[PDB]
């Protein structure tokens, strides 16, 4: 555990670096107009956005410096440089999506291009394209070949976006990733005792610095948010997870650590596909008098709604998932449905919750999921 | 020459891609405020900057797609992925310098960090740290060891900045790189016939797409500039050259292709070090009535000037390099010295030249240098 010792020493130095540099560059981002308002707060001040660029940068300098230590053989060297190319490309693309505000078309396609070094490394290092069925005898009728490479391409696209759309409250994005990376770190140390070690000693090389830099980011992103992580971070986070999952051969376990993100993605799916009107910001509404966050709604004319739309809505209404409020004015009759997100579903079930408590609750919900996965995979039921 | 055939097919597709995408993203950059005015033109309209991000992006997608072709052994695979990590990191850092407008401190240090994958690849692939003396028996008294790795670190820092400071006129930055990359391509094809082939088949993999994408950029950057290349491109260009020079083992020949850039850097050195006052923009002044570009000056109080400053200035004045105009008002006595740049020295020698002609003249001057290098290295005097 000597390269891991070096990896931890540089990760702690990376944490110090991230914590120190984020306030040092504040000026540059406010000047560059890379900032947004805390939409769930009465304060109209603009907080610097895209701070994941600073932690992501620190992350790259750390690992570039780390490269000779696990060697001072190329099977793990190709995977190291390759994974760093896919991550660097993603922090780059993420920052450009933050700066240029790209279309949903790019939010999908470009992460597939950035994930190519991982696919190519897997191709040249002859990766096992044959998968093992985790579900019972029902879907079991397999060398997925190109469809396995399609899966690896669509993994980075899911991971980054799933984090990115489960956001809008102080320390949720950096915080959820902090639970996920820690869950992978714990898992790596357990599996570091036997069988697959080369996969977990490798995954730890990327996860220990991702954790300590994200911690340095959360130092300024936690409530009250002084800085915002931005798309740059979601892109970086998603790809680092998708990368270690792919090359470490544990994307299945990793996707189980991603349970709140998966629920949020699917619960959002009718809005994301625009079958039910999707507003630009689906973050909860602040009740200025209460101080706590109340559910956000998407009101629209019921006549304009499609046959599939009113079907999905009425099935979700009955399943006690959405809070539908129908009204009628001089303009006509409307339908004010609940904004389909895990944050608003938590406010639907537990009522209005304060911002600091709501994030903390979601992080605990993330902690519970990791316990469920760790219980499933290690017999603790 | 089959992977080279594939490399050229994708490079032509890359040229088409760059030419098509640059006007498609114009909206995003104007919105993102990533734009500047053509300071040598009367028109106050803002032209989108950082377009090197689009060509640099196209470049990365091409080469990521190219990766399996020269293989479908890891000695050239590590160098390929490694060089792409150093380049991707540089397009990323360059874009952040364009967006955040970093200090001169970062313009130097950060390119050294981005060049680490090249150094590390050279370290692991056991690169020849021992250099051969090109100059005569005078400096010949050598395993430079760490000082050779210092050289490789400072190569990317020189290459990017040297291009970046020899700019400010339509198609100079993209155009000079277009002569340099073509000079390396020609040289690679000559040396592809014998001896070192693995170094030139490798250098061509990066130079053919750099050329065809930069061509696609020059399509919109040539006079009258519709778009601006930005720091993103200078960073990308510099590193791609520094990369192929380092890994291909021909940084010496490459630095001889960089002759106008070297003269411009050293001629600028008293201003860059602030021994003689350095104005923010050292680009020539447009004579609205003439239409042609006239020399730019740096006027200052002669009393405020240091003992070394007035010494360098008077040595350059006598050497017939700077045009010094001394004046005296009620405020006191001033000194209006010529802005120390190869562009203003060309206007000092040839008089006022029109912008389109001036760039074209500098590109021809770049062409002459490549002929001088090719004559030196292949006996054509
Ligand atoms: C539709 C959806 O879910 N869109 C949500 C998503 O939109 C993204 O806002 C950010 C800007 C926010 O960070 C802003 O939120 C504010 N903020 C931030 C942090 C905080 O603590 N407090 C706060 O007030 C701040 O003012 C900041 O500027 C970007 O514009 C980004 O591009 C947006 N990103 C997107 O719009 C992403 C869309 C992806 C569409 C889905 C496509 C499918 C992807 C998966 C495919 C997988 C398959 C292959 C399996 O996130 C929003 C919330 O952070 C939510 O309010 C918003 O509802
Ligand atoms: C001091 C110096 O030479 N500084 C020149 C340098 O400044 C850089 O302007 C750009 C903004 C220009 O692209 C603007 O110029 C306009 N433009 C552009 C293209 C065109 O065709 N027409 C036009 O009008 C447009 O409005 C655009 O916004 C950036 O701000 C960049 O950060 C600047 N970059 C720097 O300031 C870079 C400084 C590096 C300092 C030297 C440090 C030493 C480096 C070498 C060390 C090597 C050793 C290790 C051996 O370049 C300037 C000109 O493009 C010139 O006017 C200016 O004089
Ligand atoms: C499942 C095991 C792995 C996860 C363990 C690792 C732990 C994973 C969780 C990591 C960090 C949670 C920290 C949350 C922030 C936090 O508690 O911040 C404190 C500081 C308190 O701040 P506050 O009172 O909210 O203002
Ligand atoms: C030394 C050999 C290698 C270089 C050869 C490769 C050639 C290197 C030079 C490459 C390109 C020069 C093109 C310059 C632009 C150019 O000529 O643009 C034309 C189109 C004309 O445009 P204009 O009249 O100026 O408006």
Curated annotation (Swiss-Prot), chains A, B:
Subcellular location: Endoplasmic reticulum membrane
Disease: Congenital disorder of glycosylation 1J: A form of congenital disorder of glycosylation, a multisystem disorder caused by a defect in glycoprotein biosynthesis and characterized by under-glycosylated serum glycoproteins. Congenital disorders of glycosylation result in a wide variety of clinical features, such as defects in the nervous system development, psychomotor retardation, dysmorphic features, hypotonia, coagulation disorders, and immunodeficiency. Myasthenic syndrome, congenital, 13: A form of congenital myasthenic syndrome, a group of disorders characterized by failure of neuromuscular transmission, including pre-synaptic, synaptic, and post-synaptic disorders that are not of autoimmune origin. Clinical features are easy fatigability and muscle weakness. CMS13 is characterized by muscle weakness mostly affecting proximal limb muscles, minimal involvement of facial, ocular and bulbar muscles, and tubular aggregates present on muscle biopsy. Symptoms include difficulty walking and frequent falls.
InterPro entries registered for this protein in UniProt: DPAGT1_ins, Glycosyl_transferase_4, GPT
Any one Pfam family match given in the protein's UniProt record, by short name: DPAGT1_ins
Outcome of substituting residue 231 to A: Reduces binding to inhibitor. Nearly abolishes UDP-N-acetylglucosamine-dolichyl-phosphate N-acetylglucosaminephosphotransferase activity
Mutagenesis / variant outcome for changing residue 97 to A/N: Strongly reduced UDP-N-acetylglucosamine-dolichyl-phosphate N-acetylglucosaminephosphotransferase activity
Residues binding dolichyl phosphate: 107, 157-165
PANTHER family assigned to the protein according to its UniProt record, in alphabetical order: UDP-N-ACETYLGLUCOSAMINE--DOLICHYL-PHOSPHATE N-ACETYLGLUCOSAMINEPHOSPHOTRANSFERASE
Sites where the protein binds Mg(2+): 164, 231
Organism of derivation: Homo sapiens
Membrane-spanning ranges: 4-31, 52-71, 74-100, 104-125, 146-165, 172-192, 198-221, 230-248, 251-272, 355-379
Pathway: Protein modification; protein glycosylation
Residues that, per the record, bind UDP-N-acetyl-alpha-D-glucosamine: 37-39, 49, 170, 280-282
Quaternary structure note: Homodimer.
Effect of residue 282 to A: Reduced UDP-N-acetylglucosamine-dolichyl-phosphate N-acetylglucosaminephosphotransferase activity
Annotated protein name in UniProt: UDP-N-acetylglucosamine--dolichyl-phosphate N-acetylglucosaminephosphotransferase
């Amino acid at each position: 555990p000597m390269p891991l010792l070096i990896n931890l020493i540089v990760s702690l130095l990376g944490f110090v670096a991230t914590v120190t540099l984020i306030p040092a560059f504040r000026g540059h981002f406010i000047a560059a107009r890379l900032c947004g308002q805390d939409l769930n707060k009465t304060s109209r001040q603009q907080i610097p956005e895209s701070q994941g660029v600073i932690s992501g940068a620190v992350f790259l300098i750390i690992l570039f410096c780390f490269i000779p230590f696990p060697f001072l053989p190329h099977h793990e060297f190709v995977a190291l440089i390759g994974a760093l190319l896919a991550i660097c490309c993603m922090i780059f693309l993420g920052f450009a999506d933050d700066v240029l505000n790209l279309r949903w078309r790019h939010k999908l396609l470009l992460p597939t291009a950035a994930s190519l070094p991982l696919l190519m490394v897997y191709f040249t290092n002859f990766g096992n394209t044959t998968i093992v069925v985790p579900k019972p005898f029902r879907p079991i009728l397999l060398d997925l070949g190109i469809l396995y490479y399609v899966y690896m391409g669509l993994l980075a696209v899911f991971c980054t976006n799933a984090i990115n759309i489960l956001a809008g409250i102080n320390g949720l994005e950096a915080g959820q990733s902090l639970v996920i990376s820690a869950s992978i770190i714990v898992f790596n140390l357990v599996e570091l005792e036997g069988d697959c070690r080369d996969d977990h000693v490798f995954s730890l090389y990327f996860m220990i610095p991702f954790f300590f830099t994200t911690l340095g980011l959360l130092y300024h992103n936690w409530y009250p948010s002084r800085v915002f992580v931005g798309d740059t971070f979601c892109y970086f986070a998603g790809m680092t997870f998708a990368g270690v999952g792919i090359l470490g051969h544990f994307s299945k376990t990793m996707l189980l650590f991603f349970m709140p993100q998966v629920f949020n993605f699917l619960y959002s799916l009718p809005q994301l596909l625009h079958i039910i009107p999707c507003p630009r910001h689906r973050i909860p509404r602040l009740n200025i008098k209460t101080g706590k966050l109340e559910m956000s709604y998407s009101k629209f004319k019921t006549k304009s709604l499609s046959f599939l739309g009113t079907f999905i809505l009425k099935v979700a209404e009955s399943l006690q998932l959405v809070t539908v409020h129908q009204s009628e004015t001089e303009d006509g009759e409307f339908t004010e449905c609940n904004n389909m997100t895990l944050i608003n579903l938590l406010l639907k079930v537990l009522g209005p919750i304060h911002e600091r408590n709501l994030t903390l609750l979601l992080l605990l919900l993330q902690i519970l999921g990791s316990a469920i996965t760790f219980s499933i995979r290690y017999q603790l039921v």
